[PDB]
Design goal:
The PDB classes it as cytosolic protein. Keywords: Dynamin-related protein 1, Drp1, mitochondrial fission, GTPase, Cytosolic Protein. It forms a dimeric assembly. Two copies of one chain form a homodimer. Chain A has 19 helices and eight strands. In chain A, strand 6 (180-186), helix 6 and strand 7 form a beta-alpha-beta unit. The first copy, chain A, has an eight-stranded mixed β-sheet with strand order 3-4-2-5-1-6-7-8. In chain A, helix 13 (389-400) packs across helix 17 (500-548). The relative contact order of chain A is 0.09. Chain A folds into two domains: 28-304, Rossmann fold (3-Layer(aba) Sandwich); 327-558, Four Helix Bundle (Hemerythrin (Met), subunit A), CATH 1.20.120. By secondary structure, chain A is of the alpha/beta class. Chain A binds chain B through residues 363, 367, 371, 482, 489-490, 492-495, 497-498, 520, 523-524, 526-528, 530-532, 535-536, and chain B through 345, 348-349, 363, 482, 485, 488-494, 497-498, 520, 523-524, 527-528, 530-532, 534-536, 538-539.
Chain lengths: 595, 595
Amino acid sequence: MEALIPVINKLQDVFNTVGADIIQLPQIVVVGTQSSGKSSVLESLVGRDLLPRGTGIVTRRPLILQLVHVSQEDKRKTTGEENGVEAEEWGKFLHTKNKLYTDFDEIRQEIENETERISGNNKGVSPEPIHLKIFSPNVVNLTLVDLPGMTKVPVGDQPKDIELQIRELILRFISNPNSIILAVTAANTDMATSEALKISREVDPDGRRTLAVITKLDLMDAGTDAMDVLMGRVIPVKLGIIGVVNRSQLDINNKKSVTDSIRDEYAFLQKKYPSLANRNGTKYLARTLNRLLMHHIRDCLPELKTRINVLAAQYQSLLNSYGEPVDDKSATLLQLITKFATEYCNTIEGTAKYIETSELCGGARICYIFHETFGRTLESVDPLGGLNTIDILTAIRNATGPRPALFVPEVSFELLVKRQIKRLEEPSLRCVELVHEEMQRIIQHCSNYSTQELLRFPKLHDAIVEVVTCLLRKRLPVTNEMVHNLVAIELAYINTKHEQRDCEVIERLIKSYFLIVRKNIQDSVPKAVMHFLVNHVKDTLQSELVGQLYKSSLLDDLLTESEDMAQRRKEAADMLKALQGASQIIAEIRETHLW
Amino acid sequence: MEALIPVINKLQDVFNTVGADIIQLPQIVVVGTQSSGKSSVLESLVGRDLLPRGTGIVTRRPLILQLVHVSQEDKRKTTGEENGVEAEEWGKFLHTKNKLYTDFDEIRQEIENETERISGNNKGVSPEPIHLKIFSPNVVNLTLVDLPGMTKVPVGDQPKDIELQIRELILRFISNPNSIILAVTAANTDMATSEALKISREVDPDGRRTLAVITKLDLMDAGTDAMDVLMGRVIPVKLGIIGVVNRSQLDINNKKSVTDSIRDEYAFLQKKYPSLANRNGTKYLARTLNRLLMHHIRDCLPELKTRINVLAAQYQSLLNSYGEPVDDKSATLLQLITKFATEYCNTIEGTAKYIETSELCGGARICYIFHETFGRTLESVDPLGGLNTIDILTAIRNATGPRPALFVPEVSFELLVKRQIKRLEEPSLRCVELVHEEMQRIIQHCSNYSTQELLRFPKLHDAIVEVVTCLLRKRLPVTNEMVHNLVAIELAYINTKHEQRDCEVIERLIKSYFLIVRKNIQDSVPKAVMHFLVNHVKDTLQSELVGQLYKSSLLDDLLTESEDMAQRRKEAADMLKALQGASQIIAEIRETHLW
């Protein structure tokens, strides 16, 4: 069936209403470049002009366009949702509350107003997306995500290094293996020089998810026809290439007729391209995009279902936590503190059901630092320190003095090995902070995934984070001093009593004693850190939380709920209902589609 | 060889000064009983009256009678050893110089006066022997040890424990395996009743080294007969029994000619002893004693030669130490401090040439403590002993919570292994104390063998010993704290990162971790102890010595000297000369006796 796309659209609008996350469900992301009239193509598909276009960047903020296939039957069921104004091809904004704008001039004016208000004179990066639900009968069910396009020469007033930021934003958006890359390039510049195809190949060298679009098919008269480009024989695309005659900004701003432009484009394609005319059309292009999106949804159905189940479980836990009455504050807060301490201890030991060997965090990261980081850093130093025998001879001569060399002075050895042992001090401290910082990464990590009950009340989460940070800061100097004392004992007092022959003996003693000291440090420092820092704090975390979260009335402050938090709770309950409905709908589909 | 006899006597006048007999040597020790006529027999043997008369107790201090036959050959062994003596017949004391006693009565009076002065009014026994050498043409070369006689009158100013003191003094001499016990036995009663026989059976029931001389024969003329005791039918001996008549004190005090007494004794022996008349006598007793001594010297030739050479070398080294006293206070003190520091460092290295006669070469012993003693002590403390079913059950139930336990919680295992490891603190302190005692023994070795010149100045010796001991004792607590910290660190770390069933699992894990911790502590703690104690002392010995000993107002007090030290040095020089002479005399024998 084709209800999967409407279900995804419902999920997306719910996510936007509840602060949509970066992890988005399968959607078509459009990437353009210089002289790319993406907005013109979207208007041609819609059949009316409703967005501002421009060479390269059309809107300097992310734009979410939901083309809803609202047939004549559903016109009265969708126009009546808000206000009383109704039409056949109409757009709704959720960033701007209600106020349906049937007239496209109002939509353009609102877009310009918001762009000026937010982006300002210099157009930077705005992670907040812009949502616009378009309803029309001609348009098929589709979800388009428009972002600034990669351009060698930035258009308008923007940072000269904005190209890297745009590329990183596109990579972040298409990181999930569910986005359909709609590549739009100007016929004036070869696709090889275009950056959109470069990024598409970087994320996917094969054209398994990239649809190349050739625009500006009006200037080919002054040059060469794009027939070869559409065929795509230099860099074949496994999905195909569709080209249309893009409309200039001047004509669009003059309130032109979209039907005339579509007719001219169709005639041009039919004449210049005897074969690339059946599928190179607005309706055909929209249907091809919808089919590609459906294919991607079919491919990602297992991962999509896994993500949906994870989100449903998270929201169920959030609802269960939020519904607990504040009655009996002491017992509930004590239970929450005990649960948080148990989760933290399990994460330290790795027994918590949120971290595995695949993911580096908590105990796993500490073990990696102790074994690989610290061990490899210590091993990086050569046993002799890389000093040539000439240096050893010079040191021996300097220490012994101007007398014949017949007895080996051990002090010379002490002068050299120490220098190497001192170099072992720096990595240890570097590791200690890496461990300390790692503890900090735990504090939020659980709250990010495990202890959402902390996120329920921001005050409680902040207080717990501050208490844990203070405990870590108090324990850091003690562990650091103990490690430094161990290093000092192993460094200052080494001794051997605990010309060529003298140099050889000194070098051998240096190597042997340095290896022994390195082994001792490797065996001791991690164990000392576990003693003073990890093991000591494991059980003490619960006691510290209990003693710091309750003096006489601190419980009320911790469990404070904000109005924004209440709104988020309501939106999350709505999201939970939507997730339950989506899971019920998906359960109808057989497992044949989950492969 | 005659020269072999006097030299041994010189040894008896040197080692006995420092205490007991350092080396067993062929010698004659006279042991008497109550109412013993030893004085008369000795006077008859000497040919003149030179000892106190009377029976029972006649001398209160160890008196040595060293008769030397006059001969030009022996002169080299007499004048060279002493400051110089030459006369016809005379007695000389090694404790006195520049005075020759040509009259034996004067010798006896001087001996009595010295004994009274040293021992005071008391008749007890003092720890100070007497040296006496008698030269005459009618005395065979023989050395005897005339110990204080037995007294049966404990009452009076003399100590009530005189018998015990006399027994201990006699034992100190006869305990040597090379000594020959001349037992003076009273013929009035059975030989066993005599104290000499009683003491003889304590360690030498065979009597292989016991030569019996029967006294108190004057009163045996009427009544009981002494023939039974003379024949040895009471306590037979393997060497023979000699009968000498006890001369009356009154007759001797009246200036009785010794020749007349000898004639009377010979007549009495002929009349009363037909079996043994010319075969028994004081001269025959002296000849038998000399024969036994010479035969024992012949038997001990190899070992005696080796020991004499070793002692000669050692005393030459001591004289070299005693050779040149301090000439410049500051320079001599600095040289002594530097030499002491070097010797201490060498001893710590376990390679110093100077070594004791009872232990290892100082620092080497310390290594042994770290190898076998400490390891065996640690292994003696088995992991089992502190675990029982009741305590294990209680710990498991407490760790699990308010519900029964059917698993193996890690907290209980960690607590139990920590408690077991805490038991390892005591062996560490034992090893540290052993190392400290070894260092004290090294200090004593340096004081007594390597720094005899330091001994000459007792103040400096005491100051150095006290300073070193105080430094070691002050470094001791720091090492103890470091080892305790190491033990505490080694027990908290968890190495697993890289009801009967539960109890058995807990016990096995505890045993494994305890063994691992024992290995780790045995590998580590010795290094820390050497760093804090061995290396630190090696580095700071000179600094501490300079800081504590070097002063501008202690040179005179530290370097005090006394004439007694000069006398002891002269005695040591005489000892060295006598040892060299004995070595030269003994080096004239063939080599077949060595194998």
